[PDB]
Ligand binder design. Structure first.
Ligand code: B12
Ligand SMILES: CC[C@H]1O[C@@H](n2cnc3c(N)ncnc32)[C@H](O)[C@@H]1O
Ligand SMILES: CC[C@H]1O[C@@H](n2cnc3c(N)ncnc32)[C@H](O)[C@@H]1O
Ligand SMILES: CC[C@H]1O[C@@H](n2cnc3c(N)ncnc32)[C@H](O)[C@@H]1O
Ligand SMILES: [N+]
Ligand SMILES: [N+]
Ligand SMILES: [N+]
Lengths: 453, 252, 453, 453
């Protein structure tokens, strides 16, 4: 493989694949903080060309972290279909990009081709894609999963109801639930980020979530985004099990930072199969986002885009119902402004869909970053056109507990009526029965939480 | 005029407007399967359906026909039967066919050798034509191959109304190390000459699973010729005595 | 629980659950051979009533083989969703039958309910179902799987191309393949039962099948129905892998008789994911059929209907692409005439769809059985209305090496055009592009294998 | 014409056409009782071949009963379109079978071709057809008639309400009517078999039938299956006339056994045209079934299948609204078990549709025959796939008066929802207005006779 090229008479030489993968990224504050970013636009373009000319084998055989040192690398490498790999091992990244974007490449073609990819190869394709490339390419790669609702069908758009509270007050959480259900939010999941990480508090939150579900016979699922071990303990002790959640990182060191062992995710899958109130076969939930590995000092000199793809390679092994990046959850030290948060949101979604997971996105930003709510509305629409499986929902997007701004309940209803998208078909039938939705549009009596009383 | 049991009827091409009729002849002669008979809408053509029903009328008669006692004496074999009495009972009681009768055990320990290395047992099974047609072509070389540079050959005898698991009882009564069973498979639509070979290394009525047996099936003129078969059972028999195993317990 | 009822003033006593399950079966020659059938038509109805009033817990807690003594029982018990079980543990078998047959019971309702069931409970419901019950009940329980074709979609009907030969002659095998494709057969699988069981012969058979697939770009999958050990070894050595097959039995002793361990099926699952040319997530294939447990002496006093349902609880664990009973493959000692074979076919398919597996059926009979080809045509159409996922396909149904008669290539074309059913959507597009099918109907040039030349 | 053939080296010689027609039949207890059945499977196949090679002229010119001796033979021969006959007179029965089964033969082609057939030729085609041939061939030969409902449209399925009583009690009859109407049964006819054959009892039964019809404005028609002469007398005296019924036989001697003259059917047609409350042009009703002619000693050495076809040739002359065979009404001496009753039901329906009459079927059996209710459910579904115009309906199929079992009200609703079939469009609109049916499916409040009060 070549690690150099000539651009405008100047020779641009790179150390290894890992440096080529990093300098090909678009400019972002995270790659600068890691010391792996390109020094100029010229070196970035030169890195893109060297990357585009590398083959699938060149990148599959050079993971950012070695096999014998990292259980996420092993999991990614072990799950590769070697027959699908040998068909494309000699394809350059330029040819793989054009293969994905081709209108002559069907969804069934990609279904087998992606099995021969590794996360590093997935990241490689995204790095030489424009924003429209990321959007159109992801749109032609739908991923459909089923719990108590079906998610990811083209023409549909789901949303997670996120009713968080500063004290896990069941009156505050329930109030946000009725507000979101009145806008048609909740077909993805009703998920709560718990203030306290104890079993008894989780069961109280789950009992409140499912008390509403049982009262109106809502086709959906509940979840409390605590640590996976405490979720397992609550459900084993009798808490209503729906989706089981865990935050993931793209390296073994990053998983130890979160206190996660791979056996825990295996146990979560087994606990869901025995206890969870799920009709479909998908019951797991993961959240990702660029900057987590670097934050844990577990990127090993790799860029945040490559490390983020390794999250998707990890998640695909467990076939979860939903995965969403939390694109701007951390801060400006990884994604500074509107330009970078949008670009990362498109990359993440594209990489998730190319990996074969039910990829959503928490279009969000923080108040110490150079961003405002208009950024969330720009990205949520672009990702919807990309076929993003789901976004979040909160009253006006104001999270009173996590101290950030996500998308509003209004925003899902806006996206659905702007783009003529429907909810999950099971959830859509429920909204129609409640008089909330008619022909994908909010009725006159919608948006009113007092309708449920 | 047309005899449905004739070769001309077997070679009949019913495709109305073929793309390459010369290919249809090539494909029809390439298999015994009833290909290239055409269609009438999505339904079989009349002649093809007639030859189907005609072949079925013959196949049902090959189920209940039995080998005559005058034919087994011309081969010099012991006439032994299982617990089954007639053909109608054999089709409904596979358990009785897996066990010898009372006067059967008293004729094996008396008119046969003790502890042979290879034991050749023959039974009609589910088809008589599978035995009579291929008998003279597979047995003379089988017994000769087991004594040409072979070892202790057992005494051959014919079991009437027998199944496959009945060789487990023979393998203990005679105490043979390897027992070879030539039995007739159930009749096909087009033929009933297909013969099988069930062999096992040291069978035991209490522990032998069916996976411990090695099966050589489709022994007939259309499948594995009886002379060629006979040679591959003698090789099989030598490999069982060496590796001390049979069926899935073997190697190679 | 009651093991006793009064019918016309006559007290009928039963020893245990195992005897009630057996004597509740409709009359068949296998239960008589097993010595477990009812003595009169009155006792049979009495067993049905006793069975109808037993609860789900009564049959879940009394399997025909003990947990600590049978790995199939352990596998069936360990996979039960205990939450879904507790919801129905006190329902009577009478109430479970009415639950399944109810038009107010949706597909998603059954999706969660069936997780609380065991195979013995699945067999119990079929025993108190009439023929139309087994057909209508199975119809409203579709199971959809995906390899390179999607199977089980309501309104579709697939078929296995079965090109068996007496000498594994590839010229004869290829000839039957072109004949089957010309009728639209092959969207389920192009599966050959081999004569000799060695790695070299399986690869030769596999190269023949995939030569046809690759030359015409056929969306389907090949398979050689040898032992799973020799299939795994062949694929490991480079043979093209499609579906991995194994004949299964409903008991640990029955699996040993077949020379199969549960770890072999685990290896086949891992070998498929690493090597097989499958776009979807399902790649396993199992064949079943009443009488196999009693033939192996491994039924332990249980009737053949209950033992057959255990095949489905075992198969459900490995989530195969297709399963089909071979209803009349063995002989009249287990299923005597037309009445019994049809009944068994409806039973097997209903129990398979109730167990959540992609259930087909080899509508077949033997020549020493009291049956003819008019029987296969009766059953294939009854099962088609039941939503049977697939049947077999051979030239006029004559298997020249297995010595039995299955359904013809003409039969799948007949069923499809009679009931306005389509092939697998992927395979239908190929047939359309080949000029073999238009609007689900055979063209004028269809039924002519010389079209591929 | 040849009356012999060689099969497996053995020569099979036959006496005349009548013997060829008989020995070609599938095995049934009736042909054995008549002494005309084939002695073995070989002679049966040989008879089929000789029959398949005979021409239309060979069979048209050799009716089982001579022209000058039988008014049914004359009626059949006189109504033949000689232009349509001369086009096909030289066709062998093998070619006529393939012509009917051809997807290139449209409904309009058969419309003219059947006019050149006689009943003996119709019977000849059925004798060399498989069960699937009989089903698929009948499906592509729809026959549509109109009374107050339209029957026989592809995609529709009708049913006769049969409310019989041991004493013609108007409370028992009305109770069964409300039960059947609640399942959507009755679009074919509401027909009562009267215990007493007197005029005053008929008018009371008709007044009860039409009292319900007039109360709910039901689009349908009433009928009392007494002798045609007493029906004529009741309607002339003022009884509400709907359909006029008569049992028919395939020979003049058989009609005299029933006490029927051809002038009576001519009078029934004239009485219907003057008095009957029918909007359409079809107002007659005939019932048939294999074994009637042999029972009357009026088969004249012909088999029951050939004689049954002569029923359809007779009925076609009077263009009735509905005809149905009563397939297993008599006993085992004509059709012994499930295999024979199914086969005869498929033959009858096929022959009726090839004759151009609105062919239904009373799928039924008797208690002294080797049959059970599962036989009725097998045949009713096969015949539905064949496009059978209608079946019967009774509470659970238990006829408290005729002492036999037919199909249940549940069975019509089962067939309609299994096969996505609708009732007669006029009757479907009425059920929708009554809240009984929505989109072809029974509403939640359906199946409840108290809905009509
Ligand atoms: C019906 C049948 C079965 C039935 C047997 C039930 C019964 N017969 O009562 C069942 C469903 C069990 C079956 C399954 C299998 N069968 Co099978 N079977 C047949 C068949 C069609 C008929 C055999 C026959 O008529 N025998 C004659 C009668 C008189 O003997 P029987 O005592 O009544 O029958 C016994 C044996 O046939 C034995 N048996 C049946 N199949 C097999 C396979 C093997 C390898 C062995 C050792 C024994 C065996 O089981 C019966 C009870 O003891 C033959 C095809 C043929 N052309 O013969 C294939 C055949 C024998 N089976 C075969 C195969 C592939 C299998 C399986 C290994 C499938 C699998 N992958 O698991 C299993 C083996 C199960 C076992 N170890 O016993 C192959 C053997 C190939 C080989 N190289 O040995 C054959 C030749 C067909 C083929 N595909 O080529 N089979
Ligand atoms: C209490 C932080 C919450 O936000 C989620 N989150 C935000 N950013 C990331 C990220 N970069 N990677 C993984 N998870 C993330 C995390 O799963 C947890 O539930
Ligand atoms: C050579 C017998 C073939 O038919 C299949 N088969 C037939 N009957 C049964 C049965 N009853 N159970 C399991 N498999 C069966 C078996 O899988 C094997 O491929
Ligand atoms: C009181 C017997 C009733 O059943 C009818 N039926 C039953 N079997 C036959 C048959 N074989 N032919 C004609 N009609 C039949 C007959 O019309 C009468 O209405
Ligand atoms: N990340
Ligand atoms: N079984
Ligand atoms: N008749």
């Amino acid at each position: 493989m070549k690690l150099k090229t000539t651009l405008f008479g100047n020779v641009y030489q790179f150390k290894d694949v890992k440096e080529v993968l990093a300098k090909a990224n678009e400019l972002r504050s995270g790659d600068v903080l890691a010391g792996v970013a390109a020094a100029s636009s010229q070196e970035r373009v030169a890195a893109k060309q060297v990357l585009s000319e590398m083959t699938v084998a060149d990148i599959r055989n050079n993971p950012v972290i070695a096999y014998e040192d990292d259980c996420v690398t092993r999991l990614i490498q072990d799950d590769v279909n070697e027959t699908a790999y040998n068909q494309i091992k000699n394809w350059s990244i330029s040819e793989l990009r054009e293969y994905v974007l081709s209108d002559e490449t069907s969804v069934d073609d990609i279904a087998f081709t992606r099995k021969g990819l590794t996360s590093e190869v997935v990241a490689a394709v995204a790095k030489i894609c424009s924003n429209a490339d990321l959007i159109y390419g992801a749109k032609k790669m739908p991923v459909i999963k089923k719990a108590n609702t079906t998610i990811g069908i083209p023409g549909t758009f789901s949303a997670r109801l996120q009713p968080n509270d500063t004290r896990d007050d069941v009156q505050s959480i329930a109030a946000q639930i009725y507000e979101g259900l009145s806008f048609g939010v909740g077909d993805a999941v009703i998920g709560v980020n718990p203030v306290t990480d104890d079993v008894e508090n989780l069961s109280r939150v789950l009992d409140t979530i499912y008390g509403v579900i049982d009262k109106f016979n809502i086709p959906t699922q509940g979840c409390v985004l605590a640590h996976v071990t405490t979720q397992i303990e609550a459900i084993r002790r009798g808490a209503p099990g729906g989706l089981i959640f865990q935050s993931i990182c793209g390296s073994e060191k990053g998983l130890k930072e979160f206190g996660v062992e791979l056996a825990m995710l295996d146990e979560a899958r087994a606990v869901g199969a025995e206890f969870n109130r799920i009709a479909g076969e998908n019951c797991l939930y993961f959240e990702t986002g660029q900057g987590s590995a670097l934050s844990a000092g577990a990127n090993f000199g790799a860029d945040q885009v490559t490390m983020e793809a390794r999250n998707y390679g990890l998640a695909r092994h467990y076939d979860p119902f939903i995965v969403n990046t939390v694109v701007g959850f951390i801060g400006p030290e990884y994604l500074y402004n509107d330009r970078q948060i949008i670009r990362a949101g498109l990359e993440d979604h594209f990489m998730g869909k190319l990996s074969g997971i039910s990829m959503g996105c928490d279009c969000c930003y923080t108040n110490h970053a150079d961003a405002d709510q208009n950024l969330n509305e720009n990205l949520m629409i672009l990702l919807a056109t990309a076929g993003c499986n789901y976004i979040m929902g909160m009253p006006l997007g104001d999270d009173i507990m996590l101290n950030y701004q996500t998308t509003a309940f209004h925003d899902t209803a806006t996206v659905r009526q702007l783009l003529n998208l429907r909810p999950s078909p099971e959830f859509e039938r429920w909204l129609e029965s409640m008089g909330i939705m008619a022909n994908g549009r909010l009725t006159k009596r919608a948006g009113d939480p007092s309708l449920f009383f | 005029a047309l005899d449905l049991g004739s070769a001309e009827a077997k070679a009949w091409i019913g495709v109305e407007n073929p793309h390459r009729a010369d290919v249809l002849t090539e494909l029809r002669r390439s298999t015994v399967a009833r290909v290239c008979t055409g269609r009438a809408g999505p339904r079989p053509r009349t002649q093809a359906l007639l030859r189907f029903l005609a072949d079925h009328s013959r196949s049902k008669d090959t189920v209940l026909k039995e080998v005559p006692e005058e034919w087994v004496k011309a081969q010099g074999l012991l006439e032994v039967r299982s617990e089954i009495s007639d053909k109608n009972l054999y089709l409904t009681r596979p358990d009785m066919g897996r066990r010898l009768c009372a006067e059967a055990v008293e004729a094996l320990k008396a008119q046969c050798v003790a502890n042979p290395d290879v034991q050749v047992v023959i039974s009609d099974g589910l088809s008589t034509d599978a035995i009579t047609v291929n008998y003279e072509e597979i047995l003379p070389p089988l017994m000769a191959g087991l004594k040409q540079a072979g070892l202790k050959v057992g005494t051959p005898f014919f079991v009437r109304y027998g199944r496959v698991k009945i060789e487990d009882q023979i393998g203990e009564i005679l105490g043979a190390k390897v027992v070879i069973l030539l039995v007739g498979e159930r009749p096909g639509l087009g033929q009933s000459e297909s013969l099988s070979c069930y062999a096992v290394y040291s069978p035991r009525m209490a522990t032998t699973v069916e996976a411990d047996r090695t099966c050589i099936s489709n022994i007939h003129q259309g499948g594995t010729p009886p002379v060629e078969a006979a040679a591959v059972i003698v090789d099989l028999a030598k490999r069982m005595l060496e590796q001390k195993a049979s069926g899935i317990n073997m190697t190679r």
